[PDB]
Each structure stands twice: as C-alpha cells, then as structure tokens.
Amino acid sequence: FSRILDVQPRLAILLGDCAVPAEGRVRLLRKVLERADSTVNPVVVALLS
Amino acid sequence: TIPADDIQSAIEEYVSSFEEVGTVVDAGDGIAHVEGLPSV
What we know:
Number of helices of chain B: 1
Distance between the termini of chain A: 13 Å
Number of strands of chain B: 2
Structural class of chain A: mainly alpha
Order of helices and strands of chain A: HHHH
Strand content of chain B: 25-35%
Strand order of the largest sheet of chain B: 1-2
Distance between the termini of chain B: 47 Å
Oligomer: part of a larger assembly
Largest interface: A-B, 17 and 12 residues
Structural class of chain B: alpha+beta
Number of strands of chain A: 0
Largest sheet of chain B: 2 strands, antiparallel
Helix content of chain B: 10-25%
Helix content of chain A: 55-70%
C-alpha cells in the first residue's frame, strides 16, 4: 500500500490536508482501499485510518 | 495481490462531495493577525 501510495502521490497529497476534517478523509481512504478486496485484512485499514 | 484497479476516479466519488469570515487571533499597536479568510 505504501508502494501504490507513493507511485501515484496525488492520493497522498489529497490526504495531507491539515485543516480539513478527517471524516471525509477516512471515508475517501477506506473507500479507495476496499474498492478491491485484495486487502481482505481489516486491521491494516484500522492502522492506516 | 494489491488494489491495482487504478480507478482514481474514485477520488471523483469524493471530490463531488464538495461569506468568508475570519477571526482576530492577536492585536496591538495597530497590527492585527487574522486566522481564516482562505481567499484574501
């Protein structure tokens, strides 16, 4: 996930919004993650969120 | 086995989810600092 996060850093920067509330942030994030289920493990999602 | 979907239009699913008044934080001696006002 760090690979896919760095290689296309657009998603990285749009997650770096300091002032913006984080509910939409985590929504966006998990959503992009479980867009596919190659991430069956949920604890990774818990950590990153 | 990674989410290689490359559907970053999923960012669209979120972008589409989206009067300016600031606040004096400190003042004195004729100078004032104003928090907020993102488009001044």
